[PDB]
Design an enzyme around this catalytic site. Structure first.
Site, PDB file in Angstrom:
ATOM      1  N   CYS A  12      37.109   0.119   9.871  1.00 14.85           N
ATOM      2  CA  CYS A  12      36.802   1.270   8.990  1.00 14.85           C
ATOM      3  C   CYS A  12      35.428   1.186   8.296  1.00 14.85           C
ATOM      4  O   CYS A  12      34.634   2.171   8.309  1.00 14.85           O
ATOM      5  CB  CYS A  12      37.986   1.578   8.019  1.00 14.85           C
ATOM      6  SG  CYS A  12      39.413   0.431   8.114  1.00 14.85           S
ATOM      7  N   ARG A  43      41.934 -11.668  12.265  1.00 19.00           N
ATOM      8  CA  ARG A  43      42.673 -11.874  11.022  1.00 19.00           C
ATOM      9  C   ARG A  43      43.265 -13.281  11.143  1.00 19.00           C
ATOM     10  O   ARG A  43      43.900 -13.603  12.148  1.00 19.00           O
ATOM     11  CB  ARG A  43      43.788 -10.824  10.824  1.00 19.00           C
ATOM     12  CG  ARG A  43      43.256  -9.421  10.638  1.00 19.00           C
ATOM     13  CD  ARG A  43      44.300  -8.372  10.293  1.00 19.00           C
ATOM     14  NE  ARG A  43      43.704  -7.034  10.395  1.00 19.00           N
ATOM     15  CZ  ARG A  43      44.359  -5.892  10.198  1.00 19.00           C
ATOM     16  NH1 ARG A  43      45.638  -5.927   9.804  1.00 19.00           N
ATOM     17  NH2 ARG A  43      43.736  -4.721  10.317  1.00 19.00           N
ATOM     18  N   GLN A  58      42.172  -3.094  18.362  1.00 15.56           N
ATOM     19  CA  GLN A  58      42.877  -1.866  18.035  1.00 15.56           C
ATOM     20  C   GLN A  58      42.303  -0.688  18.801  1.00 15.56           C
ATOM     21  O   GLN A  58      41.068  -0.582  18.980  1.00 15.56           O
ATOM     22  CB  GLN A  58      42.721  -1.546  16.543  1.00 15.56           C
ATOM     23  CG  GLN A  58      43.184  -2.668  15.618  1.00 15.56           C
ATOM     24  CD  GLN A  58      42.921  -2.362  14.161  1.00 15.56           C
ATOM     25  OE1 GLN A  58      41.846  -1.906  13.808  1.00 15.56           O
ATOM     26  NE2 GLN A  58      43.899  -2.669  13.293  1.00 15.56           N
ATOM     27  N   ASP A  70      41.479   2.105  17.653  1.00 12.94           N
ATOM     28  CA  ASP A  70      41.325   2.623  16.308  1.00 12.94           C
ATOM     29  C   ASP A  70      40.525   3.927  16.274  1.00 12.94           C
ATOM     30  O   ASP A  70      39.831   4.274  17.228  1.00 12.94           O
ATOM     31  CB  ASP A  70      40.590   1.540  15.500  1.00 12.94           C
ATOM     32  CG  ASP A  70      40.741   1.679  13.999  1.00 12.94           C
ATOM     33  OD1 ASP A  70      41.590   2.453  13.477  1.00 12.94           O
ATOM     34  OD2 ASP A  70      39.987   0.934  13.318  1.00 12.94           O
ATOM     35  N   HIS A  82      38.802   6.627  12.820  1.00 10.93           N
ATOM     36  CA  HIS A  82      38.803   7.221  11.499  1.00 10.93           C
ATOM     37  C   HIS A  82      38.353   8.645  11.627  1.00 10.93           C
ATOM     38  O   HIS A  82      37.359   8.916  12.297  1.00 10.93           O
ATOM     39  CB  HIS A  82      37.961   6.374  10.541  1.00 10.93           C
ATOM     40  CG  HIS A  82      38.510   4.989  10.446  1.00 10.93           C
ATOM     41  ND1 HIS A  82      38.198   4.034  11.332  1.00 10.93           N
ATOM     42  CD2 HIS A  82      39.519   4.481   9.668  1.00 10.93           C
ATOM     43  CE1 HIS A  82      38.948   2.941  11.086  1.00 10.93           C
ATOM     44  NE2 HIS A  82      39.767   3.227  10.088  1.00 10.93           N
ATOM     45  N   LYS A 107      50.964   4.433   4.795  1.00 16.75           N
ATOM     46  CA  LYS A 107      50.923   4.385   6.265  1.00 16.75           C
ATOM     47  C   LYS A 107      52.200   4.977   6.853  1.00 16.75           C
ATOM     48  O   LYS A 107      53.286   4.526   6.500  1.00 16.75           O
ATOM     49  CB  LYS A 107      50.903   2.906   6.715  1.00 16.75           C
ATOM     50  CG  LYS A 107      49.769   2.077   6.148  1.00 16.75           C
ATOM     51  CD  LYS A 107      50.055   0.569   6.273  1.00 16.75           C
ATOM     52  CE  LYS A 107      50.395   0.154   7.712  1.00 16.75           C
ATOM     53  NZ  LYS A 107      50.426  -1.346   7.911  1.00 16.75           N
ATOM     54  N   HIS A 111      42.999   7.049   8.859  1.00 21.04           N
ATOM     55  CA  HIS A 111      42.915   5.958   9.841  1.00 21.04           C
ATOM     56  C   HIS A 111      44.065   6.091  10.777  1.00 21.04           C
ATOM     57  O   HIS A 111      45.190   6.365  10.342  1.00 21.04           O
ATOM     58  CB  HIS A 111      43.151   4.597   9.167  1.00 21.04           C
ATOM     59  CG  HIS A 111      42.347   4.342   7.923  1.00 21.04           C
ATOM     60  ND1 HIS A 111      41.733   3.176   7.734  1.00 21.04           N
ATOM     61  CD2 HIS A 111      42.145   5.095   6.738  1.00 21.04           C
ATOM     62  CE1 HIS A 111      41.097   3.169   6.536  1.00 21.04           C
ATOM     63  NE2 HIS A 111      41.345   4.360   5.925  1.00 21.04           N
TER      64      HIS A 111
HETATM   65  C1  LIG Z   1      47.254 -10.921  12.133  1.00 20.60           C
HETATM   66  C2  LIG Z   1      47.529  -9.816  13.109  1.00 20.60           C
HETATM   67  N1  LIG Z   1      47.931 -10.109  14.358  1.00 20.60           N
HETATM   68  C3  LIG Z   1      48.203  -9.163  15.250  1.00 20.60           C
HETATM   69  N2  LIG Z   1      48.583  -9.458  16.460  1.00 20.60           N
HETATM   70  C4  LIG Z   1      48.045  -7.733  14.863  1.00 20.60           C
HETATM   71  C5  LIG Z   1      48.292  -6.674  15.719  1.00 20.60           C
HETATM   72  C6  LIG Z   1      48.095  -5.386  15.251  1.00 20.60           C
HETATM   73  C7  LIG Z   1      47.670  -5.124  13.960  1.00 20.60           C
HETATM   74  C8  LIG Z   1      47.395  -3.717  13.517  1.00 20.60           C
HETATM   75  C9  LIG Z   1      47.141  -2.740  14.467  1.00 20.60           C
HETATM   76  C10 LIG Z   1      46.843  -1.444  14.086  1.00 20.60           C
HETATM   77  C11 LIG Z   1      46.733  -1.167  12.719  1.00 20.60           C
HETATM   78  C12 LIG Z   1      46.910  -2.141  11.734  1.00 20.60           C
HETATM   79  S1  LIG Z   1      46.793  -1.799  10.150  1.00 20.60           S
HETATM   80  O1  LIG Z   1      46.361  -2.878   9.444  1.00 20.60           O
HETATM   81  O2  LIG Z   1      48.024  -1.329   9.756  1.00 20.60           O
HETATM   82  N3  LIG Z   1      45.803  -0.573   9.913  1.00 20.60           N
HETATM   83  C13 LIG Z   1      44.498  -0.711  10.082  1.00 20.60           C
HETATM   84  O3  LIG Z   1      43.997  -1.750  10.419  1.00 20.60           O
HETATM   85  C14 LIG Z   1      43.620   0.481   9.808  1.00 20.60           C
HETATM   86  N4  LIG Z   1      42.417  -0.047   9.237  1.00 20.60           N
HETATM   87  C15 LIG Z   1      43.306   1.161  11.143  1.00 20.60           C
HETATM   88  C16 LIG Z   1      44.532   1.828  11.771  1.00 20.60           C
HETATM   89  O4  LIG Z   1      42.295   2.149  11.082  1.00 20.60           O
HETATM   90  C17 LIG Z   1      47.241  -3.418  12.167  1.00 20.60           C
HETATM   91  C18 LIG Z   1      47.413  -6.174  13.095  1.00 20.60           C
HETATM   92  C19 LIG Z   1      47.599  -7.487  13.489  1.00 20.60           C
HETATM   93  N5  LIG Z   1      47.360  -8.551  12.688  1.00 20.60           N
HETATM   94 ZN   LIG Z   2      41.010   1.754   9.198  1.00 20.29          ZN
END
Ligand SMILES: Cc1nc(N)c2ccc(-c3cccc(S(=O)(=O)NC(=O)[C@@H](N)[C@@H](C)O)c3)cc2n1
Ligand SMILES: [Zn+2]
Ligand SMILES: Cc1nc(N)c2ccc(-c3cccc(S(=O)(=O)NC(=O)[C@@H](N)[C@@H](C)O)c3)cc2n1
Ligand SMILES: [Zn+2]
Lengths: 398, 409
Positions: free
Chosen positions: B93, B122, B140, B142, B144, B224, B270
């Site tokens: 983002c 992460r 992702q 992804d 925005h 969300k 998002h």
């Molecule tokens: C630590 C970790 N490991 C994974 N395998 C993961 C796999 C998928 C995700 C994940 C995927 C999509 C969205 C999100 S989110 O954190 O809820 N949302 C976002 O990041 C928003 N910034 C984005 C949708 O624009 C998180 C996060 C993960 N985190």
């Molecule tokens: Zn985002």
């Protein structure tokens, strides 16, 4: 004409001080990057490469094994987790060996040609950064070829032929080749270096390539052929490179069972054809002065109405072109037709289609180009077929 | 059966201790990943999205501005250069907003839909890693969307439509949906949260989607919608998500000129549809027990000989199918026909074309499937056209087949 100024004018990318040497690709620049990936993939299909994706970072311990820690330390970004130190990869080779090492290999698997659009990070001093040419985060059209000693000549020749084959698409007139020999800090015996430098020098001569030595400028793991291209100011930039490595596979325990049943270490050839996508886009931007050939142009066609009387026809044509696989946009704004035309011209959109009442009645389009050529009234299917042909053939001009 | 087992069986990927939670994609798993990118791009096109690429790292100063440093510190990898600290991005983002912030924006430019196949890192504790489903480096699908307040309803609706449209290709239609509300650690006023949460609930209600609240599970910057898919043990994995953010754009100085020439701050939606590519591949792997739809299958067709006599013929056919855009391999080995079929069935290859002397004669092929089905002889050109149609339509099910393998009916 400077790629940095053109990159701003055509909304291709930007950079900011909160991320030195790190590129933000905007939609239009990213379209160019993606089209180059498509092109590379099509070429690697014929030349039979696999395509993989390695991890962005790996334990410092692994980079210590390769010699990267001792020979490449200052370039590497490091990060930590749970008391373990990781290097963000500055090269894709060790990841490829890791993948090679999964599953028993034999001579039947060789030459194994393993490609990756591999994101590298190298911590270049900030005073040395320049546009897209010298950045900190870039992507290589990389590959490593695992082969036998007997296969070196054919595999190196194959890489050289790929370079000239791909470069011919872009029409580069000045391609200067260098052979970069053993650097002060290196791995492998002097004997190994003797053989590797001679193999590359002989490959160049067999291909009739005049080259100059660049003494001491080889990689820590092996000598390098470099294909040098030149920007607007005639500055030299390494693009394609082919390198011969008799050392890393051994350091990473790579082996296979030979035709004669002897377990051996594979030779590894490293190569990139474009070099880094970012640098190669910088080069193309200057080479074409922003007038990208149609297949690479972020937006290939803009269709405009004169008044809203032709709005519906314009939408219809746009959908028709878009379904034909053309990157087309409608410009339906309440602006004078000469205002619209100039905007798209300055944006270097290869083709502009103008629809007035005459065009609606006839089912034709008035066609003009970003060079101000006026192609007059053309039937819509004819423009579609002409564009499809020029796109599919990746034609240098038209 | 677990995606990690099937992943090894089909040579999709591996992981090592030298890089915890970082995937090594082998050729065949990368083929699936790439085909999913092509599919998503087909939808980005249709739904009118830009596609961009933001850099892996940016100054910690910027991440501090967003509220990520306070609210997301533990998960961030950091690195340094020349006495400056950088975060490897955990989200895309802030990079998207940096792109938005280049050049004056007007209401005329909205809604601006900006997609990225965004590589995130992460720093997940090593104890909670799980195959492809929970990694440290993931991508992702992804985007925005920068829009006006008046555009929220239509733009959230658009994302919701896109989720069901894309999931329908995989045969996922009855989706479990949650609305995750304000977490204990957050930015933005109660009033802003009340609004964002109502907007998402009203959108779900308008779309006739049953949902449940999940209290306190929202992002630090906004609530969300979560679309859940289930693995082989019925564990619930967040895949699709649509989020409403009245906080980040203002924190990052995003603005546009409105219709009265007044400076306004864009709303940011998002969303990710698949979620992460790695997690979605894990889900498909388990759901189909490795029987990937033909369009996704790493190897679509295997052509095999009986004896050396048909080797020349197989090679001609392999080259012909390959030029027709099909992922095809020849199996020329001195092995019995049944041995080959069993192997390529374990490899989950949709179609196996058996070539004996009679096939060489007639220019035809005997067609078998990975489901044990004998489809008789067919003409080469007939097989090609039928495979091409199965691939282009991204069909869930094979030639003459009622029900593809899938765990959840
Ligand atoms: C630590 C970790 N490991 C994974 N395998 C993961 C796999 C998928 C995700 C994940 C995927 C999509 C969205 C999100 S989110 O954190 O809820 N949302 C976002 O990041 C928003 N910034 C984005 C949708 O624009 C998180 C996060 C993960 N985190
Ligand atoms: Zn985002
Ligand atoms: C610091 C920095 N900035 C750039 N803009 C760069 C742009 C391109 C390159 C570059 C591109 C291709 C190849 C090489 S190389 O170091 O000579 N060779 C390799 O990395 C090999 N491992 C690879 C070809 O397998 C280097 C390196 C860069 N380094
Ligand atoms: Zn290399």
């Amino acid at each position: 004409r400077d790629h940095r100024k053109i990159g701003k004018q055509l909304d291709l990318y930007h950079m900011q001080e909160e991320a030195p040497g790190m590129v933000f690709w905007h939609n239009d620049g990213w379209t160019i990057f993606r089209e180059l990936e498509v092109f590379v993939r099509s070429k690697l299909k014929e030349y039979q490469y696999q395509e993989v994706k390695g991890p962005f970072m790996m334990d410092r311990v692994l980079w210590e094994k390769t010699g990267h820690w001792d020979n490449y330390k200052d370039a590497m970004f490091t990060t930590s987790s749970e008391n373990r130190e990781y290097c963000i990869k500055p090269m894709n080779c060790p990841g490829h060996v890791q993948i090679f090492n999964q599953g028993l290999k034999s001579y039947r698997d060789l030459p194994l040609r393993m490609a990756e659009f591999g994101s590298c990070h190298r911590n270049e001093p900030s005073g040395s950064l320049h546009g897209l040419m010298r950045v900190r985060g870039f992507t290589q059209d990389d590959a490593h070829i695992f082969c036998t000693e007997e296969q070196i000549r054919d595999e190196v020749n194959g890489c050289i032929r790929l370079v000239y084959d791909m470069y011919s698409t872009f029409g580069f007139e000045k391609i200067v080749v260098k052979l970069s020999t053993r650097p002060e800090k290196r791995i492998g015996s002097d004997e190994m270096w003797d053989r590797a430098e001679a193999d590359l020098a002989v490959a160049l001569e067999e291909n009739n390539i005049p080259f100059e030595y660049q003494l001491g400028e080889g990689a820590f793991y092996g000598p390098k052929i470099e294909f040098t291209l030149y920007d607007c100011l005639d500055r030299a930039w390494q693009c394609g490179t082919v390198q011969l490595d008799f050392s890393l596979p051994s350091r990473l325990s790579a082996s296979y069972v030979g035709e004669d049943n002897e377990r051996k270490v594979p030779v590894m050839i490293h190569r990139a054809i474009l070099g880094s996508m970012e640098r190669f886009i910088g080069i193309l931007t200057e080479e074409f002065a922003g007038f990208f050939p149609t297949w690479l142009a972020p937006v290939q066609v803009v269709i405009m109405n004169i008044t809203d009387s032709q709005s519906e026809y314009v939408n219809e044509l746009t959908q028709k072109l878009s379904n034909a696989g053309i990157r087309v946009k409608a410009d339906l704004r309440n602006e004078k037709i000469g205002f619209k035309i100039r905007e798209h011209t300055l944006r270097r959109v290869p083709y502009m289609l103008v629809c007035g009442d005459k065009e609606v009645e006839s089912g034709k389009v008035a066609v003009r180009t970003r060079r101000g050529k006026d192609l007059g009234s053309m039937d819509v299917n004819e423009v579609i077929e002409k564009l499809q042909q020029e796109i599919r053939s990746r034609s240098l001009k038209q």
